[PDB]
Amino acid sequence: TRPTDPPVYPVTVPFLGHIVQFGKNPLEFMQRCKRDLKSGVFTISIGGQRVTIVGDPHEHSRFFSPRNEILSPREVYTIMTPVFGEGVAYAAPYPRMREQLNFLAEELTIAKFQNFVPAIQHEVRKFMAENWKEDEGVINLLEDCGAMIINTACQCLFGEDLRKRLNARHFAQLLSKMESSLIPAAVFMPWLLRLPLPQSARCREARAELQKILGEIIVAREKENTSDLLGGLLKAVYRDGTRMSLHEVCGMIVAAMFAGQHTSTITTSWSMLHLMHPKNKKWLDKLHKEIDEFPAQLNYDNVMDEMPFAERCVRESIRRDPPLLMVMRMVKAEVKVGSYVVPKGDIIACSPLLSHHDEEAFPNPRLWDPERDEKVDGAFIGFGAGVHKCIGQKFALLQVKTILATAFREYDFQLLRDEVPDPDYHTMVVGPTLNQCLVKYTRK
Amino acid sequence: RPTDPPVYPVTVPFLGHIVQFGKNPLEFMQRCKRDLKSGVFTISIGGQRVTIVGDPHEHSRFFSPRNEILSPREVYTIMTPVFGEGVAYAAPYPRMREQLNFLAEELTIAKFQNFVPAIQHEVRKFMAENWKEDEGVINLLEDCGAMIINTACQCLFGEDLRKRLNARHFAQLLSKMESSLIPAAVFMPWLLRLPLPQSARCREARAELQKILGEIIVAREKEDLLGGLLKAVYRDGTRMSLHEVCGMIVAAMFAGQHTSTITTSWSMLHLMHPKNKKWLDKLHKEIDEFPAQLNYDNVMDEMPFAERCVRESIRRDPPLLMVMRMVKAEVKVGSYVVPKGDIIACSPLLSHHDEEAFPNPRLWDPERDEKVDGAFIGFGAGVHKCIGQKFALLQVKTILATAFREYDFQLLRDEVPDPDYHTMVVGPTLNQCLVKYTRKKKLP
Ligand code: HEM
Ligand code: HEM
Ligand SMILES: OC(Cn1cncn1)(Cn1cncn1)c1ccc(F)cc1F
Ligand SMILES: OC(Cn1cncn1)(Cn1cncn1)c1ccc(F)cc1F
């Protein structure tokens, strides 16, 4: 304790200290901390590592503004090394990391988008046509949104040859094996990673199978690409004279697909679940009124400039239940957050989960109300902000919006459950409880 | 202190020797046996003393003592989310025994009568559907996996359970439970008090199975393994709960799935390697005696050579590396006494490589025999000896008889695969298992 420290939540069980409670309900646990300590800015213990939460939305900037030398991502992203590739992205020196991210940025922006809406529509219609064939049936909506999200992304981002060698299902399995390997505990207790774990070898094996497949597509392709993701990075030349290695190319592909697969899936699922719930009739009607204006074949302009209501729907689903609960950095140099200074060596967090539930910024936050707006500027941080803000944001909104436009024009849905699913907090990227996602479709 | 196995010296207290042991348990335990000039020694895994009874003349003093002296419960804690909380090792010891015995009395032995032809059918159906070409490239470890689930399901389940729970779906649930486990935790039990998404994947998989099994039982109550345990009445008046029935089904299939798969794969890999021509000929000479339809007697009393082949595969590379107990009361092992609170281990991997018991142990030689009585402990011994042993050998022998009568195989690699030690249950490195099949016959 220095006298310029956020209040600390009292710890019992030193070795843990709060990992079980936080682990069990992050929302409920961080709101008890904010309330009992009368402070938005506080410090918990996770396995003995101090974690300072910047849970006051008026203070959001002081987390998202500072450069890499003050608030550092590398150390928190160490867990992802076996996914992105060993010296890749956050694990490269910071200027090279930025080029790598920017090369990905410039493949989702924005002459590239031109063929995206119709490629998303085609995959959605093919999926509904093959899986929702009956007049009426029961589906698990989280599993099917998953299938659609991989199918649509693949079709937007890959040539037919890569898709003929790596089908969407096969891809989802590889991505899924990588994700289910990770142990979020270790972000806070990095010694856990010096332990032999079969999980990390499952995750390297998965990554290595992808690079192998990708390498075969590249040799094949170099015997007589244009718009597609792979062919872009193939042609990326760094500041210096040099080109990307296979390992890095695989890196940025993994990173883009890994990023969007679970988060957009969850978001599409949440959005539909709200929309189909009886109380939410008012909003389902508003959506049909936006979307029934449009033709069978949609375009860039339809989805982008002319669906502000669908967007509000997607944006509020992520507001109520952000899939990424916590944004984190390692405090390399002490920092003023409000009053208080966060000491060197702390993990500093800014939590979309917690900030999207501040009663000042989001009055009555458990209410899903798509016509609402943040009452504190910057409060919404679902896709981050500052130097690390999400670069799939635009792709993600357009994909989810396009699916909603296509699914609801064609089907009605009934939630088979009285209430909207609980969020299930046992997993790294957080979604609605899988158990509770049975829905009944009626073909219109 | 004076009556303690020599301790391998520890640097890095926190880990002990988890990394070395983690990376190559054979080489690491043989360096310990050689430099300390003692079969019986004590290593450190994350700070827990582990005493290895690595002298085969001393095997009995590990396997003989009853549950009050050498206790399994504490080492089986990791499997709680698989078998079911409170189930098997987690029940009091007498009830544990009834539960195991009920499982035992479902693989012994009027039950076996229909097993050989059900294994053959599934094997021929699999080859017919997957090895259809004149010749092709398969991954042998994956396909032995598919055969092992298909054959066991067809031996153990009624049509109705197989209709509702297909073999592939079963394999996924099993595989999801198994890839959750963190063997480190057997030695550092505090790791389990950590919220991990791994355990929740494992519980969810378990709970999907019970739910399906519960639907089969209600369906079935409106006029094989499942129906046995349904019929089981304990010593007292009472019957098994759904939770325990699920437990014993999960335990028997979890048990056989990865170990038999690994054994079938090893067996074939050796037999197909050019240097093992001598043995591949002997096998053909045993099996070419028999008709197209085999029976119990064919596989059981009349294939001593195939068995030697299976047994030597497990001898060179046992899938379960370490048999373990918690020392509740101090025990004499050779000279030395193993203190209360030590984990006492007996390692098939290490004892199957003692020069005395198994001269030149990295040689696969199916005609060899242990030169130290009891040395082979691939299926354990004493009160906890494997109860799928008989079923395992019959399954593998029946597959080998069926595969090799119909196909030849070429290892696509100069040498037999390395064992891959990154995984809980150990097999041949998946990478190195590409094999080329040549079909010897036609129809379908
Ligand atoms: C609703 C879906 C998504 C959500 C909620 C989301 C959320 C976020 C958040 C909160 C961050 C900040 C990470 C940090 O500050 O450490 C982020 C970063 C990132 N996202 Fe997403 N994201 C989504 C979709 C996508 C998609 C589809 C892509 C595919 C390109 C993507 C690629 C990335 C990348 C590369 C970063 C790091 C970029 C950088 O470090 O500058 N995301 N995302
Ligand atoms: C090649 C295949 C197999 C190998 C190498 C193997 C190995 C072993 C070993 C070493 C043990 C000793 C456990 C201990 O002392 O902790 C064991 C126990 C056991 N096995 Fe297997 N096993 C195999 C196949 C199977 C199969 C197919 C089943 C299916 C029912 C099965 C069911 C069991 C059960 C229930 C136990 C515990 C019984 C008790 O504690 O009394 N095993 N096995
Ligand atoms: O944030 C992730 C990594 N992550 C955090 N929790 C679990 N995985 C996911 N993500 C970000 N946007 C969408 N998904 C990510 C994946 C890729 C990446 F380049 C950065 C990055 F933070
Ligand atoms: O030993 C297993 C479970 N296990 C041990 N290490 C990793 N998983 C495997 N096993 C035993 N025979 C075949 N496989 C087991 C599974 C079921 C069981 F009842 C006991 C038991 F030890």
Residue numbers in the entry:
A (entry chain A): 27 to 250, 257 to 476
B (entry chain B): 28 to 250, 260 to 480
Per the authors:
Although largely a backbone trace at 3.2 Å resolution, this structure served as a search model for molecular replacement in determining the CYP51Tc–fluconazole structure at 2.35 Å, which was used as a search model against the 2.27 Å CYP51Tc–fluconazole data to reveal an alternative conformation of fluconazole bound in the active site. The two CYP51Tc–fluconazole structures reported here superimpose with r.m.s.d of 0.68 Å, revealing some conformational differences in the F-helix and the BC-loop, which may account for the distinct fluconazole binding modes and result in re-packing of protein molecules in the crystal lattice. As expected, fluconazole is bound in the active site by coordination to the heme iron via the aromatic nitrogen atom of a triazole ring and by multiple van der Waals and aromatic stacking interactions. The 2,4-difluorophenyl moiety is enclosed in the pocket formed by the heme macrocycle, the aromatic side chains of Y103, F110, Y116 (BC-loop) and F290 (I-helix), and aliphatic side chains M106, A287 and A291. Although fluconazole occupies the same pocket in both CYP51Tc structures, it adopts two conformations that differ by the 180° flipping of the 2,4-difluorophenyl moiety. A 2.6 Å H-bonding contact between the 2-fluoro substituent and the hydroxyl group of Y103 may help to stabilize orientation 2, which appears to be less sterically favorable than orientation. In orientation 1, the H-bond between the 2-fluoro substituent and Y103 is broken due to the 3.5 Å reorientation of Y103 toward M360 resulting in the 2.7 Å H-bond to its amide nitrogen and in the flipping of the 2,4-difluorophenyl ring into a sterically more favorable orientation with the fluorinated edge facing away from the heme macrocycle. Perhaps both ring conformations co-exist in the CYP51Tc-fluconazole complex, possibly correlated with the conformation of the BC-loop which affects H-bonding pattern of Y103.
